[PDB]
Design a protein around this ligand. Structure first.
Ligand code: HEM
Ligand code: HEM
Ligand code: HEM
Ligand code: HEM
Lengths: 141, 146, 141, 146
């Protein structure tokens, strides 16, 4: 469960991201595709080239869902319910990949937040991403 | 892989008793039941509505037999799985787009079926050797992913 | 989350395990130790030879806790409370090992229950073990 | 491991800038903060109760430098991680009893710290080369587990 301190840390760091949420989302994807090439099997329909508008576009959507998640930290399952459905019954991404994107999102935040990414904040974000991943995979079976 | 001679013999001995068609169909079916997300690739096989339906779908069973037939073939080259599977590796990464995690899921379902089929003859040491083979086949298959 | 059907499948199969619960637990552990040797790092204080009293005891403690979990499926978080704490603060087993032990428990069930281990049961059991695994790791951080 | 000219140049060049002492203490400290169950191996190190306590604990800092100094020597032997880490593997499995999963956790955390420290210079492709490296190291340290 996210502790009051964790909820606090998450709101404080995400806050800081602000309107860069989108660019950060795209860089997290690029990091994922290059670091973990099996994840590209889910996007045979995209141009995965550096600078791809498709990646940008998809980065922005992911980013906006996490924004929605942050705002609804006390009620995640409802807020992400359409997304849970989607991933569970249409996309059908193996649960394993969620750890991978989470890692790359953390990496992107660390590279962008020199002051804010303290050990404490790092632990709270990790816990928040694992929580987001849990909700997204909750209706799989 | 690095199987000792005794391990190699255990594996080949048990494999001698397998009806590949039957077990192929069963392992694929249980894959699709236990981890339904793996269904994503089989939209063209038809009806995967209930466990009964998956298990009974002839498309599933025919795929089960081809998959396990290649597996069976690979047991003849335990000393060179990467070589044996290089071409299938390429096909799976480049045309089929199958995340190599499914290879790991199939291998653990495979072991379950072997245990359900063989009961007490599937001892712990026997499981340990089939565990090395399945991890080895999954690694050879994931090799050409780039 | 467990469907009501999953709850039925679980009680059905475990009922079947009955008095052999302890023997199946020892066997699950022996399978784990041989198949996944990094798990042995958690028992450097144990005699791990086949049929050792220590393995047999732990086996029985493991089965009792699973029995307790089947008995109180609608209330796992409460029923395994003490065990969540123990694994969280004292034992601190990396969460990955729970999947390994789960797999070996599944294998043992398959080997012992020819008539009951249908595809639907198989699935409910895997979810059940995954749920137990979730409860035991829930207080980790 | 297998690194392209591109990737090898990237790893060595960034490493040149790393103060092993500073980065090693940080990588170990964040490991025990983020995944607290890893504290199980460091009972004699002191108070590890809260973040501030971990980070400025002298035994943590010390141990961080040792581990990273060993990691560094491995970078000079990208071609034979296995023989380079054979002795340490045996130590970790036989004497320290450390689940090799922790090597994977450390590797992820080190990537994080390198990102935090280097910012935009730690680009996607650089990340990528470091990810193969930490996975190679993790696998070379898990090699002697039996
Ligand atoms: C942080 C966890 C994730 C979040 C918040 C997330 C969010 C989303 C969103 C908002 C969409 C678009 C839905 C719509 O169009 O309204 C989406 C689609 C999709 N997601 Fe997820 N996702 C996550 C993880 C993943 C992972 C790990 C993968 C696989 C590597 C994945 C693969 C995709 C695919 C392939 C699509 C469809 C892309 C398209 O064809 O437009 N997602 N995701
Ligand atoms: C032991 C692991 C596996 C082996 C040896 C294997 C083997 C093969 C073989 C030999 C083919 C046919 C190649 C050809 O037509 O030349 C094939 C095709 C296929 N495989 Fe795999 N396979 C494995 C696992 C999987 C898994 C886990 C999935 C996904 C859930 C999968 C999905 C497919 C699909 C979608 C096709 C194409 C079917 C068609 O077009 O009819 N395979 N596989
Ligand atoms: C289904 C998952 C599991 C269940 C239900 C479970 C249950 C138990 C129980 C009931 C105890 C004894 C508590 C007592 O004495 O008060 C125990 C202890 C322990 N468990 Fe867990 N366990 C599980 C998974 C694991 C895993 C995955 C590992 C490591 C590979 C592990 C390692 C230990 C150790 C080493 C002990 C202490 C043994 C001794 O010193 O007597 N457990 N567990
Ligand atoms: C992954 C890269 C790692 C490398 C290269 C490595 C290297 C080392 C070295 C050089 C030593 C000193 C041993 C000697 O006396 O010869 C050592 C000790 C030790 N390592 Fe590792 N290590 C690694 C990871 C870890 C991890 C992740 C943990 C656990 C979380 C760990 C736990 C220990 C402990 C408990 C000791 C002994 C400390 C003491 O003496 O109290 N190591 N390691």
């Amino acid at each position: 469960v996210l502790s009051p301190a964790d909820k606090t840390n998450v709101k404080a760091a995400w806050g800081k991201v602000g309107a860069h949420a989108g660019e950060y989302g795209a860089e997290a994807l690029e990091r994922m595709f290059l670091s973990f090439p099996t994840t590209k099997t889910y996007f045979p329909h995209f141009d995965l080239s550096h600078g791809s508008a498709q990646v940008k576009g998809h980065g922005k959507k992911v980013a906006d869902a996490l924004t929605n998640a942050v705002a609804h930290v006390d009620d995640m399952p409802n807020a992400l319910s359409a997304l849970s459905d989607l991933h569970a019954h249409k996309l059908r991404v193996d649960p394993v990949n969620f750890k991978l994107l989470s890692h790359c999102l953390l990496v992107t935040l660390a590279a962008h937040l020199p002051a804010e990414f303290t050990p404490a904040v790092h632990a709270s974000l990790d816990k928040f991403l694992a929580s987001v991943s849990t909700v997204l995979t909750s209706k799989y079976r | 892989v690095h199987l000792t001679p005794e391990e190699k013999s255990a594996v080949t001995a048990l494999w001698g008793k397998v009806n590949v068609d039957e077990v192929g169909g069963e392992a694929l079916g249980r894959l699709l039941v236990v981890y339904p997300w793996t269904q994503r690739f089989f939209e063209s096989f038809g009806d995967l509505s209930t466990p009964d339906a998956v298990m009974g779908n002839p498309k599933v069973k025919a795929h089960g037999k081809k998959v396990l037939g290649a597996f069976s073939d690979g047991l003849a080259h335990l000393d060179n799985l990467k070589g044996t599977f290089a071409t299938l590796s390429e096909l799976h990464a480049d045309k089929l787009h199958v995340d190599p995690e499914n290879f790991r899921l199939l291998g653990n379902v495979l072991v379950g079926v072997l245990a359900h089929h063989f009961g007490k003859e599937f001892t712990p040491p026997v499981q340990a050797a089939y565990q090395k083979v399945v991890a080895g086949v999954a690694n050879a298959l994931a090799h050409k992913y780039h």
